[PDB]
């Protein structure tokens, strides 16, 4: 299969980048909105994707036959003005992991590739998994106008048998 | 500062960009040279290098009051055709990175920051440390025409009060 | 060496002026501005500042064969007016106590003294560390209008490889 | 009370001067006359005086609604040529300390303060207290004229249901 | 550098050397001034000299580099006449190895090596340790002129944060 | 008996020369040959030689009332080209340390001193126990070629009721 190797090359680069413009929004929360654990958890999500979110793909790829191509190209020009515009913006970059990975899933199925529909799997469940807990930290910004307090519900927050 | 600034944002770029580097030659020692324990060896270096190398410059940037700066563009045209060469490249960047390092402390003396060059005491150590235990492994290569023997050695290796 | 001996005594000298006044400083927050937490903050600086801070410079003067000498003239004639205005102060404090340090430092290494500029790293290094930890409870007035909340936040923060 | 107030306030004073030049008498003990357990035995006072016995003031101040003062002038222009006379000195010290205690006890009652005559108690016994435990190094100077035996003893010194 | 392995050849002969007229001493208290404590004193300064001393000279040999040399030429024809007048001779021997030391600190930082002066830090710390441990033992031959009391002293002494 | 302190004297001699030139050939073998086991194997045979073997002389020479002597000539101008000529070496100097022991036997015989020949038994003893020792390294230069191998069989080694 050339299209599925194509398709999780291009996820591959997609994570990567993910993970270094998270780091990034995790230093601009810690320092400039004075946030430390609004920071942690964006922090806690770039590890996320620069770990077992292309570790995984690498290994499918060793086990399987096909080859690996690394191309990376990331830059922060513009940062947004407070914290909730920041959290948005995460919120947006994983609603559009979503339908990439849908794109993938359907294409697997399109060619009698079992073993590949099975792999993507668990990306499938694992998208609407952070999409939630993004979604959780996003609502407090509608709940409260004290900064402090929205930093101890996320401090409590840091510190399933479908999805979890 | 202006000069240590820059020069601790070329730095991080550095790191990172010997991270993603290494990740894709672990991927191509384990899969095209039948050498698993060659690839945990590279894997660990690049874990290393993603991680606490560069946490600790985004954690000393907010302490002092310096900007950060993300502009990455890594690409891999072209790998080598033995293990031996592969070794041989990363010892070289290991080298590299200790001149880097030797510039960064001169200038940090030049100017009256005894706090940047307190800080980089820790890079100009471990620099001689990570050239160090990647010369041991460089060097099998040179004792043994045996692949099983030597991957056997650096299983081994895999699971100082001034160094170390 | 009579210029390091001078800067030393010097050293000790702002020291104990130092501690004296955050104890006075401490009494005012917790007695006149209603808030318990921010007296034991700054009394905890008090103690710091009256005994490893000036311990350390008699062992070394015991150890290197320098002369000692005690001369010390406190008063406090005026304090803020809210508890903003009173952490601002200790920031500015400590801020001072940075560059003396640093100047202590240069003088060392212009005279081939390397003993004494391997004492005056622990100052070099402390001076960050507290300076941090006393701009992390500065912030905190900046997030909330409710001196209940930041009590809270300030009683959670009272009970690293290179700085901490 | 402001006479009270004032005696309370002059306490505070004494007790700080005392420690500081305690500190520096534990110095030149250990430095310059070579018992450094006569040192630790001076330096312990040092830190009592300037611990609890300024503290307690100050948390009464705290409680009963009185005012505080900060004012210190201290200043060594001469010491002592061996340890007897050092020590000596220290016992003048303590018992001009217990004249002014009994003076406080005295104003006390005669203003119908029986709180405040309740508080200085305290003082009224640690006085003896800390005289007796003096005394008890200085008879040592007139039984032996051995330096090491002196320092063997109070090193065993140093390592009641009415007073102690 | 030429100039630094220059100088670290020399330390290790230095080292050596000073190994095996200490051994020598050590038996000569023993023996000649019935004082066994004193004895084990000193022995232990030689195993000092003539392990880690040099150890890690050879260890730092085989990371950066560097070549190795061994010219060893001790006599002892002559010893004192005291246990005061050993005891001071070996003050002397090490408040010589003092400037030694401080001498390659600098020749280490006039040519940026900053591997080097990382290195040499360890030994300018223990230098100043050493010579205060010494300094103790050669303080008692002054408070005392009973040797049984000087010996017990030493035995109990037989069986820090920046220095220790 | 004089012929019996020559005799020892010299002994002590050689023992301390030896202990000098097995520590240049554990650096030699671990840096320039690649085989950093046979550098452990040869240093643990200089700090016993360097160790006991001469403790144990001038204890005795504590005990019975003889004179030390402290003369020490040490140089290494050549060394081996492999490293099966390096523990050959190593095996001839054994060799010879069984002839010198023998002869002081004889000598501690031929005068009726008993309590020297019941001294010298433990060197008689302890001659054969690291001659055979070291035979067990020497013969596996003969048994493969592979470095490794060897390296792997020694490691092992490193970490009786009449001899051992
Ligand atoms: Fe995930
Ligand atoms: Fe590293
Ligand atoms: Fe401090
Ligand atoms: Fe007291
Ligand atoms: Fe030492
Ligand atoms: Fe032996």
Same mark, same amino acid.
């Given at each position: 299969?050339?299209?599925?190797?194509?398709?999780?090359?291009?996820?591959?680069?997609?994570?990567?980048?993910?993970?270094? &413009? @998270? +780091?990034?929004?995790?230093? /601009?929360? =810690?320092?400039?909105?004075?946030?430390?654990? #609004?920071?942690?958890?964006?922090?806690?999500?770039?590890?996320?994707?620069?770990?077992?979110?292309?570790?995984?793909?690498?290994?499918?790829?060793?086990?399987?036959?096909?080859?690996?191509?690394?191309?990376?190209?990331?830059?922060?020009?513009?940062?947004?003005?407070?914290?909730?515009?920041?959290?948005?913006? &995460? @919120? +947006?970059?994983?609603?559009? /992991?979503? =339908?990439?990975?849908?794109?993938?899933?359907? #294409?697997?199925?399109?060619?009698?590739?079992?073993?590949?529909?099975?792999?993507?799997?668990?990306?499938?469940?694992?998208?609407?998994?952070?999409?939630?807990?993004?979604?959780?930290?996003?609502?407090?910004?509608?709940?409260?106008?004290?900064?402090?307090?929205?930093?101890?519900?996320?401090?409590?927050?840091?510190?399933?048998?479908?999805?979890?």
């Amino acid at each position: 299969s050339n299209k599925i190797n194509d398709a999780l090359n291009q996820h591959y680069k997609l994570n990567v980048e993910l993970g270094l &413009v @998270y +780091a990034h929004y995790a230093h /601009v929360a =810690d320092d400039e909105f004075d946030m430390p654990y #609004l920071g942690k958890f964006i922090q806690h999500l770039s590890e996320d994707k620069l770990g077992v979110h292309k570790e995984y793909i690498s290994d499918y790829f060793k086990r399987n036959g096909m080859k690996l191509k690394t191309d990376v190209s990331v830059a922060v020009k513009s940062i947004p003005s407070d914290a909730k515009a920041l959290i948005q913006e &995460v @919120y +947006a970059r994983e609603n559009e /992991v979503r =339908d990439h990975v849908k794109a993938i899933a359907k #294409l697997a199925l399109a060619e009698d590739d079992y073993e590949s529909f099975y792999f993507i799997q668990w990306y499938v469940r694992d998208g609407l998994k952070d999409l939630t807990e993004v979604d959780d930290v996003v609502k407090l910004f509608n709940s409260s106008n004290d900064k402090l307090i929205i930093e101890e519900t996320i401090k409590e927050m840091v510190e399933h048998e479908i999805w979890g």
